[PDB]
Every structure is written in C-alpha cells, then in structure tokens.
C-alpha cells in the first residue's frame, strides 16, 4: 500500500492556483525520497521537518496540494509572506509544518487563473472559488462588470518565450499533521 | 469621483512630510492605491502601493522612508514621507488602480520640494 | 523587470491627422496595456484600458490595438486638444510599476 504521490506529481492538468486542488492521503507507505533524491525540482524547501527524517516519521494524514503560478510567484508559497498570490489564491500558515515543491512547467503549460481582487487577505488554506463581480465602491454591482464592478479572476498569460520569471511553474505543498489519532501515512 | 491631494510643501533634506489624499466615487479600503511621482521633466515612478487586504510594497529607491497608509473613516490614503533627500523632489499622485482596467481615477498631484 | 519602450520620442502632427503612436513590452503581457495622456501641468487621463476598450469620456477617435509585445494608439483625427504626451502602463506583473517613456505630440510645421 503505497502512497499515490505519483497521481499528483505526474498528473496531466494543473488546476489553477485559487481553485487549488488537495490530495488527503491516508493508509499507505510513503518513500519521501524518491521525490528529494530527484533532481527534477527547482525549489524544494521543507519546514517543520528535514526531509532525511521524512522516511522516519509517521504522522496522522498528508495533503498534498497543487497548482501553477508563475516563477517569481513561487516566493509567496512559504510562510509569513504577502504579495497577490499569499493574500488572495493560497495562504501558509505562520506555524507551517510542511514542504514545498515546484519544477518549471513552461514545455506542458504555454487558461491559468489567479485571484486578483478580495476585501481581506485568505486564512491559511482557505480556497476562494467565488465568481462574484467585486464591489470596489459602494454601489452594488449586480452581475454587471463595469466602473467599480470588477471580475475578481484574471488570466496568467502564459507564453513560452518569456523570462523564466513569468513562465508556469508547478506546485505541490506537502502539508504533515500529527494528531491524537491512528497514524495512518508511515515512511519506511 | 475624484481624489483630492494635500499635503505638499518646501522642507529641508532629512525632514518629514505628509501626503493626503481623500476620496468620493469609490471605497479606499476596497481598492489597490497607489501613489506615483514625477519630477520635473521626467516620467512617471512608482512610489507605494497599499493592497485591499491591507499588504504594502515599495519601490526600492524609498524602503525603509515611507510609509502608505489609509484610515477607512475618511476614505483617506496617506504617504509619511521620512528622511527626504533632494532626490524626492517631484509631484506626487494618488490613484486607483482598477488593475485591468487601468489606473482611472487620478489625484490633482500635490508638489514636494526637497533643498537646504 | 517588465520594460515598455515608447518608440518615438517626438512625433510632429497636424490637425486632422490620423496619427499612431506606438508602444513595447519585454515580454508578451497579452493585452493587459494601458494608455495614458497628460497635458503639461496636469494629472494623467487614462484612455484605453486592456490594449483597446476605450475609457467612459474618452473620445471616439482614440482606440487601441495590439497584444503580445506591441501595441498602437491610434489617433483617427487629431483635434487641437491632443497635442500632449502619452503613457503606456502593463498590468501583467503589477506589484513593480513600469511605465513608458512618453511620446510628446508637437505640431507639424
């Protein structure tokens, strides 16, 4: 019974980053070493945790969360920032126990959304799918796009011949929790 | 809908200053403000910009001086303008940025002056 | 990191002109450019926003055009009130603003 890392590393379609998809993974063995010992990430940073210990550790449940964004977006996936992408599409926690990993995605990705328009900023792992037309005055707005009557989403541009900076990145962020409950997700 | 500036005036390098800028056809607290300079015979710089959600950035020639700020009371957006230099001598503008569809709403521009 | 390049500086025009002025982005920012005009003086009026909707009180005979990495305003009639200079803005990766250099229209003579 091992752990289907491979459905959400290898999948074929990437959701877009303020419709992020989560992956509750439960039951199962887990080498967390087929994925450090890769070579195939640009940016793998982990931090409740060291990734040698990982095939040490048993915990309660993992989810696995993914998405794309774009390369000097991948900054904003780590706890304690700001910035469109924290404060609107996807929120770590202060306090986050967890990984984040990302790989170039320009050959399969160049459509991709993101969230550009909220009243507040998103709790952590909070997912805002909402299509609502944002009220940026204090008219109502009435399903009617125009002055002070914004769409909230608007589109990445993805475009192959640009600056690595602006192409798409993938995303999984590997979130580990530890409850008073049958640890089900072992490395071994 | 209109922004009204304020706030401008001589002071000597090293001062302080404050910009207001006060609102009527739109929420500040619901909106991107951005503040944006222009010295004489240049183009337009970015300045500060305060998100919805309440996050700030600066452009890098002005971390650690300045500081974007809003009271929801008043629809007022502020500008604290610390440790001035010659260099910030220029008009500055507020507006709001509707992002996609453009920057719309533009402030009169309000003058800095910065010499000993 | 996204620089726009007005393309002439000057352009000299006359009135009833159908005059384009020109704009340039370092990388393909689709349609997600803003036009700008500012008389000497003043604030500046935004007039086409997403490379060609026109703005609410702009005139008829400005639009916009392009997408990727160049783009036109156009002027179908100059009227004696446009002779000003134009900004373009991207709105791609906005939390660093970039605008362009400026194209001043002077008159033809």
């Known amino acids: 019974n091992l752990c289907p890392f491979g459905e959400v590393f290898n999948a074929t379609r990437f959701a877009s980053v303020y419709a992020w998809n989560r992956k509750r993974i439960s039951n199962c063995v887990a080498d967390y070493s087929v994925l450090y010992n890769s070579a195939s990430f640009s940016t793998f940073k982990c931090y409740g945790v060291s990734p040698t210990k990982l095939n040490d550790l048993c915990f309660t449940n993992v989810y696995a969360d993914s998405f794309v964004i774009r390369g000097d977006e991948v900054r904003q996936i780590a706890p304690g920032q700001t910035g469109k992408i924290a404060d609107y599409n996807y929120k770590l926690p202060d306090d986050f126990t967890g990984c984040v990993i990302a790989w170039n995605s320009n050959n399969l990705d160049s459509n991709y959304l993101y969230r550009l328009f909220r009243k507040s900023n998103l709790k952590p792992f909070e997912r805002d799918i909402s299509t609502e037309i944002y009220q940026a005055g204090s008219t109502p707005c009435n399903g009617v796009e125009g002055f002070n009557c914004y769409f909230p989403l608007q589109s990445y541009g993805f475009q192959p011949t640009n600056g690595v900076g602006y192409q798409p990145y993938r995303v999984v962020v590997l979130s580990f929790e530890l409850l008073h409950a049958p640890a089900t997700v072992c490395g071994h | 809908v209109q922004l009204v500036e304020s706030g401008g005036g001589l002071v000597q390098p090293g001062g302080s200053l404050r910009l207001s800028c006060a609102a009527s056809g739109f929420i500040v607290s619901s909106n991107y403000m951005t503040w944006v300079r222009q010295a004489p015979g240049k183009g337009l710089e970015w300045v500060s910009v305060i998100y919805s959600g309440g996050s700030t950035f600066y452009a890098d020639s002005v971390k650690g001086r300045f500081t974007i700020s809003r009271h929801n009371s008043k629809n007022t957006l502020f500008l604290q303008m610390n440790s001035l230099r010659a260099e910030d001598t220029a008009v500055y503008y507020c507006a709001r940025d509707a992002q996609n569809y453009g920057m719309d709403v533009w402030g009169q521009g309000t003058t800095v002056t910065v010499s000993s | 990191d996204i620089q726009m390049t007005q393309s002439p500086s000057s352009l000299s025009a006359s009135v009833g002109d159908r005059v384009t002025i020109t704009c340039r982005a370092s990388?393909?920012?689709?349609?997600?450019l803003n036009w700008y005009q500012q008389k000497p003086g003043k604030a500046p009026k935004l007039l086409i926003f997403a490379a060609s909707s026109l703005q609410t009180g702009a005139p008829s005979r400005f639009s916009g055009s392009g997408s990727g990495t160049d783009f036109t305003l156009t002027i179908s009639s100059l009227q004696p009130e446009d002779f000003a200079t134009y900004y373009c803005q991207q709105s791609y990766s906005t939390p660093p603003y970039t605008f362009g250099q400026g194209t001043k229209l002077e008159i033809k003579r």
């Open positions: 990388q393909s920012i689709s349609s997600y």
